[PDB]
Amino acid sequence: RSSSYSGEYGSGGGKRFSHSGNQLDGPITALRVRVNTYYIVGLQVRYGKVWSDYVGGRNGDLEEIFLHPGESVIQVSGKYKWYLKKLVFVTDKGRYLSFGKDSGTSFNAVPLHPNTVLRFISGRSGSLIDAIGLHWDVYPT
Ligand SMILES: [Cl-]
């Protein structure tokens, strides 16, 4: 009734990953994004207290952000072409958490149903992030 999906943004390269089985650990509380001049290289997401497996490669610099207590992502925009290139996570505390350089084809993802937040991500990866998708749902009870 409340879940929705935005995606997939990127190419068909790489291999699928999904954090759907990480939801049970809790809401998103932190993000790691490995970045270079051209690409989103890797991703890791913290669900409650539990970091997901890392996906992607190592040819970039690791950027990390903890969300403030009770803060959630409510919109994600970005850029891609043959791989993912840029991500901006917009939060319900007004923060715009940006990773990567402005180049490529844009996407702009918002949740379909009322009062939902980013609950987990999925996508495709190898040595880079080939594609990403955003999964929205209610903030967990
Ligand atoms: Cl590209």
Residue numbers in the entry: 22 to 162
The authors write:
Zymogen granule membrane protein 16 (ZG16) is produced in organs that secrete large quantities of enzymes and other proteins into the digestive tract. ZG16 binds microbial pathogens, and lower ZG16 expression levels correlate with colorectal cancer, but the physiological function of the protein is poorly understood. One prominent attribute of ZG16 is its ability to bind glycans, but other aspects of the protein may also contribute to activity. An intriguing feature of ZG16 is a CXXC motif at the carboxy terminus.
Here, we describe crystal structures and biochemical studies showing that the CXXC motif is on a flexible tail, where it contributes little to structure or stability but is available to engage in redox reactions.
